[PDB]
Ligand binder design. Structure first.
Ligand SMILES: [Zn+2]
Length: 71
């Protein structure tokens, strides 16, 4: 019902394949993606806003993982 859907992101034209999780597609995530500059854009043919755990973790853990490397 609320967990039997699929991801609404396309990784290089690939409709993920992994089902949707508890996360939601927001602005912060969009901005996060833009910074990373990758081939991940929202699909407009969809009706819901729910991404998979895979993309959620992948996108969230790029601006929060370490705090020391060179500066
Ligand atoms: Zn996905």
């Amino acid at each position: 019902s609320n967990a039997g859907q699929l991801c609404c992101l396309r990784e290089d034209g690939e409709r993920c394949g992994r089902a949707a999780g508890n996360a939601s597609f927001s602005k912060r995530i969009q901005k996060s993606i833009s910074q990373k500059k990758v081939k991940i854009e929202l699909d407009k043919s969809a009706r819901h806003l729910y991404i998979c755990d895979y993309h959620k973790n992948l996108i969230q853990s790029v601006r929060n993982r370490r705090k020391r490397k060179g500066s």
